[PDB]
């Protein structure tokens, strides 16, 4: 469903970890069980593992928004976006 | 300890009479052509010829 917001494109994500792991930006109210079902339905893949982590607002006078990025490991299939 | 009276301009300018800066000892270098401190080494060329 509409739980994925933005793919992450960085040296840590794109140059490395991109062999089999894909990083995304998810809603701030979803668990790792809802990210596995959403990825398969949209990308037609089979997910093997899913890690998640939280990020706090950063002062920039005002603060940037908080983020939540998850990393999914697929057993079979490739996104190749 | 503390000053009883403030200092006036007339008195302040007389004390600073000898508070001057010195003019260095400089001469024209035989080979460089620029000015040089006596008994030193020409910065421009590097020759002393003692």
């Amino acid at each position: 469903r509409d739980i994925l917001k933005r793919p992450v494109i960085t040296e840590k994500s794109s140059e490395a970890m991109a062999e089999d792991k894909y990083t995304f930006d998810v809603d701030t109210r979803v668990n790792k069980t809802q990210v596995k079902m959403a990825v398969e339905e949209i990308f037609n893949v089979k997910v093997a593992s899913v890690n998640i982590m939280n990020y706090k607002p950063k002062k920039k006078q005002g603060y940037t928004n908080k983020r939540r990025k998850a990393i999914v490991t697929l057993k079979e299939g490739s996104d190749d976006l | 300890a503390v000053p009883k009276r403030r200092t006036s301009k007339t008195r302040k300018n007389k004390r600073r009479t000898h508070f001057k800066i010195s003019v260095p000892g400089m001469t024209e270098c035989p080979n460089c052509g620029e000015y040089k401190l006596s008994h030193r080494v020409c910065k421009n060329c590097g020759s002393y010829n003692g």
Partner: protein
């Protein structure tokens, strides 16, 4: 007869370090107050190296420092081996006056007048 704003224990180590750095490089920069005292300290180490006796080779080891010079590469002759060797064979006929001081003017940030000391 100078103290150089240091204690007796530091005024001896700094002199041992300045004498060894010169024998290796043959030309160094320092202040004027340090150059006029290191002058007499280095001129006596060459006097010992011109006698050649083993007794003199052991008295020079009390002031010299253990430092290798790879430039020569012939076993990386120690600082003490350079003396009694390359340096002892140059001033054979010269009796005194193995150094020369040169002025350069004050240095920025400190006001101290830099000097150049080298072996003649």
């Amino acid at each position: 007869y100078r103290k150089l704003g240091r204690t007796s224990d530091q005024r001896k180590a700094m002199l041992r370090d300045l004498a060894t750095s010169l024998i290796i490089s043959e030309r160094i920069e320092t202040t004027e107050a340090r150059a006029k005292e290191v002058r007499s300290v280095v001129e006596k180490l060459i006097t010992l190296g011109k006698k050649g006796d083993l007794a003199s080779r052991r008295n020079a080891a009390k002031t010299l420092r253990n430092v290798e010079i790879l430039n020569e590469d012939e076993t990386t002759q120690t600082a003490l081996q350079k003396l009694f060797g390359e340096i002892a064979e140059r001033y054979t006929e010269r009796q005194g006056g193995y150094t020369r001081i040169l002025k350069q003017g004050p240095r920025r940030g400190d006001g101290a007048e830099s000097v150049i000391i080298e072996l003649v």
